[PDB]
């Protein structure tokens, strides 16, 4: 079995969430470009090292297990009880790879949609900008994912639940900044949608990975434009300013 990291929303604290995200980042990844860890190169990565599993539980003591691809930290599918569900693969190699996940489940399904936000938002009937994140949302998403396996969850609710999980797990692993946003929500017992600073970072993760690894001794060939909390645009010209912001990058050749 692939490595498993457990998290529960029941009695969750800033510390327990912090420990969780640190453990996830630890199973995902020392190999650093300009001070920032790089995820493993897909080329040369054996299939038995391709995925990690995140098992989420809630107050209702329901559990689901998400499968993340270590090459990009992103969710590819999940297991609930005797069933597993996978986003539609982009290519034949990826489709073959996911056959290695959850091999003992009785029922396997592939969705007719991929796991990218632009599509998930359409299916959810809401933009990320209007979907609350926090411990409450995560608790509800876990129940929704679980009940999708028994018929009790409609597609829009499922898609919304994926959007919640991906941001609170994958994007938090990718960015200390987003991890900090989730910690703040936990600390003050709040639920709220991500602001433009978060959305733009999420959207820019691939571009930042490329800019950082292609940089000239840390300096960007061309500036990357991000947004502040209030939506105003600013430019980043250097890797150094991003060190406290981005935790992991996709490997670039």
């Amino acid at each position, epitope marked *: 079995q692939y490595p498993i990291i457990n998290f529960t929303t029941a009695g969750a604290t800033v510390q327990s969430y912090t420990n969780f995200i640190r453990a996830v980042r630890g199973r995902l990844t020392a190999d650093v470009r300009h001070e920032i860890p790089v995820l493993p190169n897909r080329v040369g990565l054996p299939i038995n090292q391709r995925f990690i599993l995140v098992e989420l539980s809630n107050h209702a003591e329901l559990s689901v297990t998400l499968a993340l691809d270590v090459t990009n930290a992103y969710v590819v599918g999940y297991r609930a*009880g*005797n*069933s597993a569900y996978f986003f539609h693969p982009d290519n034949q190699e990826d489709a073959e790879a996911i056959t290695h996940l959850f091999t003992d489940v*009785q*029922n396997r*399904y*592939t*969705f*007719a*949609f991929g796991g990218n936000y632009d599509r998930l938002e359409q*299916l959810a009937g809401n933009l990320r900008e209007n979907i609350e994140l926090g411990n409450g949302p995560l608790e509800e998403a876990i129940s929704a994912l679980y*009940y*999708y*396996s*028994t*018929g*009790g969850t*409609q*597609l829009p609710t*499922l*898609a919304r639940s994926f959007i919640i999980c991906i941001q609170m797990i994958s994007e938090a692993a990718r960015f200390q900044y987003i991890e900090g946003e989730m910690r703040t929500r936990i600390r003050y017992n709040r639920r709220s949608a991500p602001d433009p600073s978060v959305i733009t970072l999420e959207n820019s993760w691939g571009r930042l990975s490329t800019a950082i690894q292609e940089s000239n001794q840390g300096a960007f060939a061309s500036p990357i434009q991000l947004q502040r909390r209030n939506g105003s645009k600013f430019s980043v010209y250097d890797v150094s300013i991003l060190i406290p912001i981005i935790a992991l990058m996709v490997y670039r050749c």
Partner: nanobody
Amino acid sequence: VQLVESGGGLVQPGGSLRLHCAASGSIASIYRTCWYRQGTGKQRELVAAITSGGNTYYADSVKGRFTISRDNAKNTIDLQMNSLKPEDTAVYYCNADEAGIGGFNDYWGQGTQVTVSS
């Protein structure tokens, strides 16, 4: 795919009904088949569901009393309703929903009235 419900009616509290839904086409590959209900002046709510794999879901309000069944050869979906209560009064709808597996088609029946009353 057309869905046609039947078997609704009036019962006294404690009575039983069995709702029937006939699909005009194959439901074998349709992920979710469900019963929803809508009371007067309220929003439609999920009552029970069964997947193409045979897993089931029941709303808290009906657990123990209702049983959903599904026949993938005859293309029918049934709801056995026991120990009925006035609170169960509503229009019941059958739903066949691909739910993002294989496609996005979502079929609804026209609904049938259930009334539990003295």
